[PDB]
């Protein structure tokens, strides 16, 4: 049993809710919140900008030190950093950004990072300002992630479309 509330069950292990991931993280304080990161961990907009703003920029400060030490992530890769006031840990995962021309096949590699964590609160990777089709992202999630994932979808209109079209 866990504290996630109001989710629709899509499969054995994938759950979905119309929610602001920031507000959901603040309320649940999950072990892991996933950030929709880029390779530079520059949290300017989208989910990343919102999560970072909610940490009062502490996520960005920590991220800048990480990059200075380790260099950029790979597209499809991830790193574990602090969850600050939102979660125990933040798993920064880099999905391909279609608006930069990155290969969408890398979306499966990106979701494979979730399998290293038993339970996660997450957005749909490569959705929103990353330019991919969220219906496709949900399909890859369901077909790749085997651990327990609670997906937060900000847009109510999109949430209803994802549910109604789910196979």
JSON list of C-alpha atoms in Angstrom, two decimals:
[
{"chain": "A", "resi": 1, "resn": "UNK", "atom": "CA", "xyz": [0.00, 0.00, 0.00]},
{"chain": "A", "resi": 2, "resn": "UNK", "atom": "CA", "xyz": [1.22, 3.53, -0.81]},
{"chain": "A", "resi": 3, "resn": "UNK", "atom": "CA", "xyz": [-0.03, 7.11, -0.41]},
{"chain": "A", "resi": 4, "resn": "UNK", "atom": "CA", "xyz": [-0.82, 7.93, -4.05]},
{"chain": "A", "resi": 5, "resn": "UNK", "atom": "CA", "xyz": [-4.51, 8.90, -4.31]},
{"chain": "A", "resi": 6, "resn": "UNK", "atom": "CA", "xyz": [-7.04, 9.40, -7.11]},
{"chain": "A", "resi": 7, "resn": "UNK", "atom": "CA", "xyz": [-5.09, 7.58, -9.86]},
{"chain": "A", "resi": 8, "resn": "UNK", "atom": "CA", "xyz": [-6.68, 5.54, -12.61]},
{"chain": "A", "resi": 9, "resn": "UNK", "atom": "CA", "xyz": [-5.01, 2.14, -12.99]},
{"chain": "A", "resi": 10, "resn": "UNK", "atom": "CA", "xyz": [-3.87, 1.50, -16.58]},
{"chain": "A", "resi": 11, "resn": "UNK", "atom": "CA", "xyz": [-1.94, -1.74, -16.08]},
{"chain": "A", "resi": 12, "resn": "UNK", "atom": "CA", "xyz": [-0.50, -3.94, -13.34]},
{"chain": "A", "resi": 13, "resn": "UNK", "atom": "CA", "xyz": [2.16, -1.29, -12.65]},
{"chain": "A", "resi": 14, "resn": "UNK", "atom": "CA", "xyz": [1.19, 2.01, -14.35]},
{"chain": "A", "resi": 15, "resn": "UNK", "atom": "CA", "xyz": [-1.22, 4.56, -12.87]},
{"chain": "A", "resi": 16, "resn": "UNK", "atom": "CA", "xyz": [-2.26, 7.99, -14.19]},
{"chain": "A", "resi": 17, "resn": "UNK", "atom": "CA", "xyz": [-3.84, 11.17, -12.81]},
{"chain": "A", "resi": 18, "resn": "UNK", "atom": "CA", "xyz": [-4.65, 14.71, -13.98]},
{"chain": "A", "resi": 19, "resn": "UNK", "atom": "CA", "xyz": [-2.40, 16.59, -11.59]},
{"chain": "A", "resi": 20, "resn": "UNK", "atom": "CA", "xyz": [0.33, 19.19, -11.26]},
{"chain": "A", "resi": 21, "resn": "UNK", "atom": "CA", "xyz": [3.44, 17.10, -10.51]},
{"chain": "A", "resi": 22, "resn": "UNK", "atom": "CA", "xyz": [4.72, 19.90, -8.25]},
{"chain": "A", "resi": 23, "resn": "UNK", "atom": "CA", "xyz": [1.58, 19.82, -6.10]},
{"chain": "A", "resi": 24, "resn": "UNK", "atom": "CA", "xyz": [1.51, 16.05, -6.14]},
{"chain": "A", "resi": 25, "resn": "UNK", "atom": "CA", "xyz": [5.14, 15.83, -5.02]},
{"chain": "A", "resi": 26, "resn": "UNK", "atom": "CA", "xyz": [4.54, 18.37, -2.24]},
{"chain": "A", "resi": 27, "resn": "UNK", "atom": "CA", "xyz": [1.64, 16.30, -0.90]},
{"chain": "A", "resi": 28, "resn": "UNK", "atom": "CA", "xyz": [2.99, 12.75, -1.27]},
{"chain": "A", "resi": 29, "resn": "UNK", "atom": "CA", "xyz": [6.73, 13.40, -0.70]},
{"chain": "A", "resi": 30, "resn": "UNK", "atom": "CA", "xyz": [7.51, 10.32, -2.82]},
{"chain": "A", "resi": 31, "resn": "UNK", "atom": "CA", "xyz": [10.81, 8.50, -2.58]},
{"chain": "A", "resi": 32, "resn": "UNK", "atom": "CA", "xyz": [11.45, 9.45, -6.22]},
{"chain": "A", "resi": 33, "resn": "UNK", "atom": "CA", "xyz": [10.11, 12.27, -8.39]},
{"chain": "A", "resi": 34, "resn": "UNK", "atom": "CA", "xyz": [11.18, 12.21, -12.03]},
{"chain": "A", "resi": 35, "resn": "UNK", "atom": "CA", "xyz": [12.28, 15.42, -13.73]},
{"chain": "A", "resi": 36, "resn": "UNK", "atom": "CA", "xyz": [11.95, 15.96, -17.48]},
{"chain": "A", "resi": 37, "resn": "UNK", "atom": "CA", "xyz": [15.58, 17.05, -17.71]},
{"chain": "A", "resi": 38, "resn": "UNK", "atom": "CA", "xyz": [17.90, 18.08, -20.52]},
{"chain": "A", "resi": 39, "resn": "UNK", "atom": "CA", "xyz": [21.54, 17.01, -20.81]},
{"chain": "A", "resi": 40, "resn": "UNK", "atom": "CA", "xyz": [22.78, 20.25, -19.23]},
{"chain": "A", "resi": 41, "resn": "UNK", "atom": "CA", "xyz": [20.32, 20.07, -16.30]},
{"chain": "A", "resi": 42, "resn": "UNK", "atom": "CA", "xyz": [19.21, 23.60, -17.22]},
{"chain": "A", "resi": 43, "resn": "UNK", "atom": "CA", "xyz": [15.76, 23.65, -15.64]},
{"chain": "A", "resi": 44, "resn": "UNK", "atom": "CA", "xyz": [14.27, 26.56, -17.55]},
{"chain": "A", "resi": 45, "resn": "UNK", "atom": "CA", "xyz": [10.74, 25.58, -18.46]},
{"chain": "A", "resi": 46, "resn": "UNK", "atom": "CA", "xyz": [8.22, 22.82, -18.71]},
{"chain": "A", "resi": 47, "resn": "UNK", "atom": "CA", "xyz": [8.20, 20.31, -15.87]},
{"chain": "A", "resi": 48, "resn": "UNK", "atom": "CA", "xyz": [11.84, 21.05, -15.04]},
{"chain": "A", "resi": 49, "resn": "UNK", "atom": "CA", "xyz": [11.29, 24.78, -14.71]},
{"chain": "A", "resi": 50, "resn": "UNK", "atom": "CA", "xyz": [8.28, 24.16, -12.48]},
{"chain": "A", "resi": 51, "resn": "UNK", "atom": "CA", "xyz": [10.04, 21.63, -10.23]},
{"chain": "A", "resi": 52, "resn": "UNK", "atom": "CA", "xyz": [13.09, 23.87, -9.91]},
{"chain": "A", "resi": 53, "resn": "UNK", "atom": "CA", "xyz": [10.96, 26.93, -9.10]},
{"chain": "A", "resi": 54, "resn": "UNK", "atom": "CA", "xyz": [9.25, 24.93, -6.34]},
{"chain": "A", "resi": 55, "resn": "UNK", "atom": "CA", "xyz": [12.71, 24.27, -4.80]},
{"chain": "A", "resi": 56, "resn": "UNK", "atom": "CA", "xyz": [13.51, 28.01, -4.78]},
{"chain": "A", "resi": 57, "resn": "UNK", "atom": "CA", "xyz": [16.29, 27.29, -7.35]},
{"chain": "A", "resi": 58, "resn": "UNK", "atom": "CA", "xyz": [18.08, 24.81, -5.05]},
{"chain": "A", "resi": 59, "resn": "UNK", "atom": "CA", "xyz": [17.63, 22.11, -7.72]},
{"chain": "A", "resi": 60, "resn": "UNK", "atom": "CA", "xyz": [19.45, 24.33, -10.25]},
{"chain": "A", "resi": 61, "resn": "UNK", "atom": "CA", "xyz": [22.30, 25.10, -7.82]},
{"chain": "A", "resi": 62, "resn": "UNK", "atom": "CA", "xyz": [22.81, 21.39, -7.12]},
{"chain": "A", "resi": 63, "resn": "UNK", "atom": "CA", "xyz": [22.54, 20.59, -10.83]},
{"chain": "A", "resi": 64, "resn": "UNK", "atom": "CA", "xyz": [25.17, 23.16, -11.82]},
{"chain": "A", "resi": 65, "resn": "UNK", "atom": "CA", "xyz": [27.63, 21.57, -9.39]},
{"chain": "A", "resi": 66, "resn": "UNK", "atom": "CA", "xyz": [26.77, 18.11, -10.81]},
{"chain": "A", "resi": 67, "resn": "UNK", "atom": "CA", "xyz": [27.47, 19.25, -14.38]},
{"chain": "A", "resi": 68, "resn": "UNK", "atom": "CA", "xyz": [30.66, 21.05, -13.41]},
{"chain": "A", "resi": 69, "resn": "UNK", "atom": "CA", "xyz": [31.96, 17.78, -11.93]},
{"chain": "A", "resi": 70, "resn": "UNK", "atom": "CA", "xyz": [30.55, 15.20, -14.35]},
{"chain": "A", "resi": 71, "resn": "UNK", "atom": "CA", "xyz": [29.72, 16.93, -17.62]},
{"chain": "A", "resi": 72, "resn": "UNK", "atom": "CA", "xyz": [26.42, 16.58, -19.48]},
{"chain": "A", "resi": 73, "resn": "UNK", "atom": "CA", "xyz": [24.12, 13.60, -19.36]},
{"chain": "A", "resi": 74, "resn": "UNK", "atom": "CA", "xyz": [23.37, 11.47, -22.42]},
{"chain": "A", "resi": 75, "resn": "UNK", "atom": "CA", "xyz": [20.04, 11.71, -24.21]},
{"chain": "A", "resi": 76, "resn": "UNK", "atom": "CA", "xyz": [18.25, 8.66, -22.81]},
{"chain": "A", "resi": 77, "resn": "UNK", "atom": "CA", "xyz": [20.30, 8.85, -19.60]},
{"chain": "A", "resi": 78, "resn": "UNK", "atom": "CA", "xyz": [19.67, 9.95, -16.04]},
{"chain": "A", "resi": 79, "resn": "UNK", "atom": "CA", "xyz": [21.17, 10.90, -12.72]},
{"chain": "A", "resi": 80, "resn": "UNK", "atom": "CA", "xyz": [19.88, 10.76, -9.15]},
{"chain": "A", "resi": 81, "resn": "UNK", "atom": "CA", "xyz": [20.07, 14.01, -7.19]},
{"chain": "A", "resi": 82, "resn": "UNK", "atom": "CA", "xyz": [18.28, 15.41, -4.16]},
{"chain": "A", "resi": 83, "resn": "UNK", "atom": "CA", "xyz": [14.52, 15.76, -4.18]},
{"chain": "A", "resi": 84, "resn": "UNK", "atom": "CA", "xyz": [14.85, 18.89, -2.02]},
{"chain": "A", "resi": 85, "resn": "UNK", "atom": "CA", "xyz": [11.46, 19.82, -0.51]},
{"chain": "A", "resi": 86, "resn": "UNK", "atom": "CA", "xyz": [9.56, 17.71, -3.07]},
{"chain": "A", "resi": 87, "resn": "UNK", "atom": "CA", "xyz": [10.76, 14.10, -2.63]},
{"chain": "A", "resi": 88, "resn": "UNK", "atom": "CA", "xyz": [13.61, 12.12, -1.14]},
{"chain": "A", "resi": 89, "resn": "UNK", "atom": "CA", "xyz": [15.32, 11.91, -4.54]},
{"chain": "A", "resi": 90, "resn": "UNK", "atom": "CA", "xyz": [14.90, 13.43, -7.97]},
{"chain": "A", "resi": 91, "resn": "UNK", "atom": "CA", "xyz": [15.64, 11.17, -10.93]},
{"chain": "A", "resi": 92, "resn": "UNK", "atom": "CA", "xyz": [16.60, 13.56, -13.73]},
{"chain": "A", "resi": 93, "resn": "UNK", "atom": "CA", "xyz": [15.79, 11.70, -16.96]},
{"chain": "A", "resi": 94, "resn": "UNK", "atom": "CA", "xyz": [16.61, 13.03, -20.43]},
{"chain": "A", "resi": 95, "resn": "UNK", "atom": "CA", "xyz": [14.04, 12.07, -23.02]},
{"chain": "A", "resi": 96, "resn": "UNK", "atom": "CA", "xyz": [14.73, 13.02, -26.64]},
{"chain": "A", "resi": 97, "resn": "UNK", "atom": "CA", "xyz": [13.65, 16.56, -27.55]},
{"chain": "A", "resi": 98, "resn": "UNK", "atom": "CA", "xyz": [11.94, 16.42, -30.96]},
{"chain": "A", "resi": 99, "resn": "UNK", "atom": "CA", "xyz": [12.32, 20.19, -31.27]},
{"chain": "A", "resi": 100, "resn": "UNK", "atom": "CA", "xyz": [16.12, 19.57, -31.29]},
{"chain": "A", "resi": 101, "resn": "UNK", "atom": "CA", "xyz": [15.89, 16.62, -33.78]},
{"chain": "A", "resi": 102, "resn": "UNK", "atom": "CA", "xyz": [16.76, 13.78, -31.34]},
{"chain": "A", "resi": 103, "resn": "UNK", "atom": "CA", "xyz": [15.89, 10.20, -32.17]},
{"chain": "A", "resi": 104, "resn": "UNK", "atom": "CA", "xyz": [12.53, 9.16, -30.68]},
{"chain": "A", "resi": 105, "resn": "UNK", "atom": "CA", "xyz": [13.78, 5.61, -30.34]},
{"chain": "A", "resi": 106, "resn": "UNK", "atom": "CA", "xyz": [15.78, 7.00, -27.42]},
{"chain": "A", "resi": 107, "resn": "UNK", "atom": "CA", "xyz": [12.50, 7.35, -25.55]},
{"chain": "A", "resi": 108, "resn": "UNK", "atom": "CA", "xyz": [12.57, 3.66, -24.60]},
{"chain": "A", "resi": 109, "resn": "UNK", "atom": "CA", "xyz": [16.12, 4.01, -23.23]},
{"chain": "A", "resi": 110, "resn": "UNK", "atom": "CA", "xyz": [14.95, 7.03, -21.20]},
{"chain": "A", "resi": 111, "resn": "UNK", "atom": "CA", "xyz": [12.09, 5.07, -19.62]},
{"chain": "A", "resi": 112, "resn": "UNK", "atom": "CA", "xyz": [14.43, 2.15, -18.79]},
{"chain": "A", "resi": 113, "resn": "UNK", "atom": "CA", "xyz": [15.95, 4.39, -16.09]},
{"chain": "A", "resi": 114, "resn": "UNK", "atom": "CA", "xyz": [12.67, 4.11, -14.17]},
{"chain": "A", "resi": 115, "resn": "UNK", "atom": "CA", "xyz": [13.28, 0.36, -13.66]},
{"chain": "A", "resi": 116, "resn": "UNK", "atom": "CA", "xyz": [16.06, 1.15, -11.17]},
{"chain": "A", "resi": 117, "resn": "UNK", "atom": "CA", "xyz": [13.43, 2.49, -8.72]},
{"chain": "A", "resi": 118, "resn": "UNK", "atom": "CA", "xyz": [10.61, 0.48, -7.18]},
{"chain": "A", "resi": 119, "resn": "UNK", "atom": "CA", "xyz": [8.09, 3.37, -7.11]},
{"chain": "A", "resi": 120, "resn": "UNK", "atom": "CA", "xyz": [8.17, 6.75, -8.89]},
{"chain": "A", "resi": 121, "resn": "UNK", "atom": "CA", "xyz": [6.07, 9.85, -9.47]},
{"chain": "A", "resi": 122, "resn": "UNK", "atom": "CA", "xyz": [6.74, 10.96, -13.04]},
{"chain": "A", "resi": 123, "resn": "UNK", "atom": "CA", "xyz": [5.65, 13.02, -16.04]},
{"chain": "A", "resi": 124, "resn": "UNK", "atom": "CA", "xyz": [5.35, 11.58, -19.52]},
{"chain": "A", "resi": 125, "resn": "UNK", "atom": "CA", "xyz": [8.86, 11.72, -20.96]},
{"chain": "A", "resi": 126, "resn": "UNK", "atom": "CA", "xyz": [9.42, 13.80, -24.09]},
{"chain": "A", "resi": 127, "resn": "UNK", "atom": "CA", "xyz": [5.90, 15.29, -23.84]},
{"chain": "A", "resi": 128, "resn": "UNK", "atom": "CA", "xyz": [5.09, 18.98, -23.54]},
{"chain": "A", "resi": 129, "resn": "UNK", "atom": "CA", "xyz": [7.86, 21.26, -24.77]},
{"chain": "A", "resi": 130, "resn": "UNK", "atom": "CA", "xyz": [10.01, 18.24, -25.72]},
{"chain": "A", "resi": 131, "resn": "UNK", "atom": "CA", "xyz": [7.71, 17.84, -28.72]},
{"chain": "A", "resi": 132, "resn": "UNK", "atom": "CA", "xyz": [6.81, 14.14, -28.77]},
{"chain": "A", "resi": 133, "resn": "UNK", "atom": "CA", "xyz": [3.31, 12.70, -29.04]},
{"chain": "A", "resi": 134, "resn": "UNK", "atom": "CA", "xyz": [2.16, 12.05, -25.44]},
{"chain": "A", "resi": 135, "resn": "UNK", "atom": "CA", "xyz": [0.04, 9.09, -26.58]},
{"chain": "A", "resi": 136, "resn": "UNK", "atom": "CA", "xyz": [3.22, 7.49, -27.89]},
{"chain": "A", "resi": 137, "resn": "UNK", "atom": "CA", "xyz": [5.09, 8.36, -24.70]},
{"chain": "A", "resi": 138, "resn": "UNK", "atom": "CA", "xyz": [2.44, 6.62, -22.60]},
{"chain": "A", "resi": 139, "resn": "UNK", "atom": "CA", "xyz": [2.62, 3.52, -24.80]},
{"chain": "A", "resi": 140, "resn": "UNK", "atom": "CA", "xyz": [6.42, 3.36, -24.46]},
{"chain": "A", "resi": 141, "resn": "UNK", "atom": "CA", "xyz": [6.09, 3.87, -20.70]},
{"chain": "A", "resi": 142, "resn": "UNK", "atom": "CA", "xyz": [3.65, 0.98, -20.33]},
{"chain": "A", "resi": 143, "resn": "UNK", "atom": "CA", "xyz": [5.74, -1.29, -22.56]},
{"chain": "A", "resi": 144, "resn": "UNK", "atom": "CA", "xyz": [9.08, -0.43, -20.88]},
{"chain": "A", "resi": 145, "resn": "UNK", "atom": "CA", "xyz": [8.61, 0.37, -17.20]},
{"chain": "A", "resi": 146, "resn": "UNK", "atom": "CA", "xyz": [8.11, -2.66, -14.96]},
{"chain": "A", "resi": 147, "resn": "UNK", "atom": "CA", "xyz": [8.31, -0.86, -11.62]},
{"chain": "A", "resi": 148, "resn": "UNK", "atom": "CA", "xyz": [5.39, 1.06, -10.14]},
{"chain": "A", "resi": 149, "resn": "UNK", "atom": "CA", "xyz": [4.93, 4.41, -11.87]},
{"chain": "A", "resi": 150, "resn": "UNK", "atom": "CA", "xyz": [2.42, 7.13, -10.99]},
{"chain": "A", "resi": 151, "resn": "UNK", "atom": "CA", "xyz": [2.07, 9.48, -13.96]},
{"chain": "A", "resi": 152, "resn": "UNK", "atom": "CA", "xyz": [0.97, 13.08, -13.44]},
{"chain": "A", "resi": 153, "resn": "UNK", "atom": "CA", "xyz": [-0.53, 14.80, -16.49]},
{"chain": "A", "resi": 154, "resn": "UNK", "atom": "CA", "xyz": [-0.93, 18.57, -16.02]},
{"chain": "A", "resi": 155, "resn": "UNK", "atom": "CA", "xyz": [-3.40, 19.21, -18.86]},
{"chain": "A", "resi": 156, "resn": "UNK", "atom": "CA", "xyz": [-6.94, 17.93, -18.18]},
{"chain": "A", "resi": 157, "resn": "UNK", "atom": "CA", "xyz": [-7.77, 17.85, -21.87]},
{"chain": "A", "resi": 158, "resn": "UNK", "atom": "CA", "xyz": [-4.69, 15.72, -22.59]},
{"chain": "A", "resi": 159, "resn": "UNK", "atom": "CA", "xyz": [-5.34, 13.46, -19.59]},
{"chain": "A", "resi": 160, "resn": "UNK", "atom": "CA", "xyz": [-8.83, 12.62, -20.90]},
{"chain": "A", "resi": 161, "resn": "UNK", "atom": "CA", "xyz": [-7.43, 11.94, -24.38]},
{"chain": "A", "resi": 162, "resn": "UNK", "atom": "CA", "xyz": [-4.71, 9.64, -22.97]},
{"chain": "A", "resi": 163, "resn": "UNK", "atom": "CA", "xyz": [-7.24, 7.60, -20.98]},
{"chain": "A", "resi": 164, "resn": "UNK", "atom": "CA", "xyz": [-9.86, 7.42, -23.72]},
{"chain": "A", "resi": 165, "resn": "UNK", "atom": "CA", "xyz": [-7.33, 6.28, -26.35]},
{"chain": "A", "resi": 166, "resn": "UNK", "atom": "CA", "xyz": [-5.44, 3.82, -24.12]},
{"chain": "A", "resi": 167, "resn": "UNK", "atom": "CA", "xyz": [-5.28, 0.27, -25.44]}
]
